[PDB]
Ligand binder design. Structure first.
Ligand SMILES: *[C@@H]1O[C@H](CO)[C@@H](O)[C@H](O)[C@H]1NC(C)=O
Ligand SMILES: *[C@@H]1O[C@H](CO)[C@@H](O)[C@H](O)[C@H]1NC(C)=O
Lengths: 409, 421
């Protein structure tokens, strides 16, 4: 009666969107188990951070014991040690576009490039790069819905003989109860690897004169014992996430524009240290440094010898999340994860939900304050996706949805 | 007339046989460049995975698939790995894209802001250091990167490459090469480029042993002897082929069309049986990736006097080599019938043109069960009123077809929109 949910996401998606998808799928498993079904979530191995650069365990990035407190999880390679083929692949796809529904349908592009039947009950696919993994069955399902809709799909009678089901294009589903208790439980469960935390904490204490005791950012080991608070101070530094490439292809500051913002914030807050999270090339960083007043110092984690890119991103995000004040980039999922981290640490909202303005719009739109939780319309949710076709939703009809169209993956 | 190197790449998610077509576009660019006095040599991009549903492995040499000496007779070529051994940097990447305006149709190009998804594919790390896929090689970088909107052909790309902005670059890589169309589609230089793409002799030997053992077929009795040097090929339509029917049987419709363009399994059985009776053939060479149960079903439906053959000695050959063997075996049939709009089929048709088969035996497409008088492919004959529309420039995403006419509007173009890649 053990059942396994596997999943994957559109190949062109980034690390931080995938982290969001985890929570969608975790909540599906939570619902499944609350309805009496003994489902285990199989964690999909991580791949390349940059598309211009395989099979990495979650334990490199996240603390599995924390994830396990919300739902039972295992690594893909632990799933493989049960020597059971995958019974079913369901490839989610969109309806051409407020109505929750699903149906098995003919495969839209590009599903038939991704899976190939070689025998009656043998379908090949990428399967995270693992040779010798196959599925007994494959189909496409059009779906418009959330974790609850996916629960319903998974309990369909067509799969009642399947103990292992893989849901591809999992980013197709939305959150149920966006910004509410179960959303935040799923997010709170995603504690970073202790090894990453130790690395980041050594950097905080050495370079940023920052530690949990003086910063008032002590967190209990067990995230389920977290209590609400707004008393975090953080370290004596300004955290900035500085995105230079515009993945929406107007919305980002120039290099001088950024220097001005940083200088104003540093004066207003009496800060002399800046922790800069960026992949900007060295000459643009040097330009930015040269434009800053001489008493401000910029820091970056760059002792990255063994660390892969996802680990560095998490370190960057953890360092930003422990700043006294954070300012991030427009519509960036990297930024959104930092905002969530600061919510969990228990920082005042004013220090958290801040976005860099472009040079022409000094009072630009600032991000919605999705606050941790333990009518007029709500804010629109963040997009379900960072490239291609997705949706936002609004709640208070008591629920609404709209397309968000992003550039091609 | 210092040595210059042209590298290129193609949209990920384009397939092997479309890439073979793009080669010819870029080979003709090099041929034009060299005809205009520019000492360019073409660097052959390593091959990736044949299937998008397979584990990417090490980047593969062209010599596994093609005879490099034959390619070299049209233009000078080198393997990427050999280009690397010269410790020559990559000076410039030009990432081709469409005009953001879109569009009558004019040949033109212009440096422009990068359309999606160029920013994901190349990343500046230092002033003169751009990272990118570079065929999966880690230490390879470019000194410069830009996007160029372009509408045109091999000639337009030649012009772009001779622009003064690049005159200090010895090594230029052109990405999204499938963005350019053929110049003079279906004419002499098109066919020279195609004729140059002789298959690896090791693949030819394997295929010929199969022909002789199973298909009662060899070049002497088939009248399909080709001269070793393709530049000495003369026009002839004297090929008769082996005593077998060649069929390329696609099951997945990569156009995801609303109405079926492929026959069913019973539909295919009927077609094969009818053709075998009409042509008095008892042997069928089947080229397909269909799963084994669909093939067994097809076999079971065929009259007991028909024998179906497939190359299945596969376990020291990669998938591209097998596909080439399949194509070569189909190309030596007395009669060939292929699948709608399939680039695999189109390459076979071109093979048969080179071997010198009557056009009737070549330009045949399998009809779906509901349209027994379905549209048949244009007979683009080898060359040594408006034309037909060219085949699409791509197999996924946005491309173009063109149509041409001579004298005594010379050319026109239209968008063709395919499923996403
Ligand atoms: C279940 O199978 C039936 C029979 O093919 C099909 O009509 C139906 O759509 C399938 N439903 C799902 C969700 O698989
Ligand atoms: C040549 O270089 C200049 C430098 O910005 C640019 O404006 C121009 O468009 C370039 N031309 C081409 C076709 O690369």
């Amino acid at each position: 009666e053990k059942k396994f949910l596997l999943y994957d996401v559109n190949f062109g998606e980034g690390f931080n969107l995938r982290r969001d998808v985890y929570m969608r799928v975790a909540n599906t498993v939570r619902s499944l188990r609350d309805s009496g079904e003994n489902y285990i979530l199989v964690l999909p191995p991580w791949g390349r951070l940059h598309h211009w650069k395989v099979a990495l365990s979650w334990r490199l990035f996240f603390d599995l014991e924390s994830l396990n407190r919300f739902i039972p999880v295992i690594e893909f390679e632990d799933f493989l040690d049960e020597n059971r083929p995958i019974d079913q692949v369901i490839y989610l796809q969109h309806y051409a576009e407020y109505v929750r529904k699903f149906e098995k349908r003919s495969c839209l592009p590009p599903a038939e490039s991704h899976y190939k039947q070689v025998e009656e009950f043998k379908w090949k696919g990428w399967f995270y790069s693992y040779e010798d993994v196959y599925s007994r069955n494959f189909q496409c399902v059009s779906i418009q819905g959330d974790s609850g809709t996916l629960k319903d799909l998974l309990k369909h009678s067509n799969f009642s003989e399947s103990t292992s089901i893989m849901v591809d294009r999992a980013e197709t589903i939305l959150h149920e109860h966006y910004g509410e208790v179960d959303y935040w439980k799923a997010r709170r469960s995603m504690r970073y690897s202790n090894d990453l935390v130790d690395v980041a904490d050594a950097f905080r204490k050495k370079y940023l004169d920052s530690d949990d005791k003086r910063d008032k950012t002590k967190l209990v080991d067990d995230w389920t014992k977290e209590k609400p608070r707004r008393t975090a101070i953080g370290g004596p530094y300004l955290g900035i996430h500085w995105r230079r490439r515009d993945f929406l292809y107007a919305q980002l500051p120039t290099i001088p524009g950024t220097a001005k913002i940083l200088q104003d914030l540093c004066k207003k807050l009496d800060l002399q240290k800046i922790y800069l999270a960026t992949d900007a090339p060295d000459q643009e960083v040097d330009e930015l440094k040269a434009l800053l007043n001489g008493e401000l110092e910029v820091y970056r984690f760059t002792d990255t010898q063994k660390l892969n890119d996802g680990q560095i991103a998490i370190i960057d995000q953890y360092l930003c999340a422990h700043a006294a004040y954070f300012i991030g980039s427009y519509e960036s999922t990297f930024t959104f994860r930092i905002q969530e981290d600061r919510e969990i640490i228990g920082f005042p909202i004013s220090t958290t939900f801040n976005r860099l303005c472009p040079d022409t719009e000094p009072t630009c739109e600032q991000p919605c304050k999705w606050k941790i939780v333990y009518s007029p319309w709500s804010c629109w949710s963040d997009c379900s996706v960072t490239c291609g076709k997705g949706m936002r939703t609004r709640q208070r009809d008591l629920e609404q949805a709209e397309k968000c169209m992003l550039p091609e993956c």
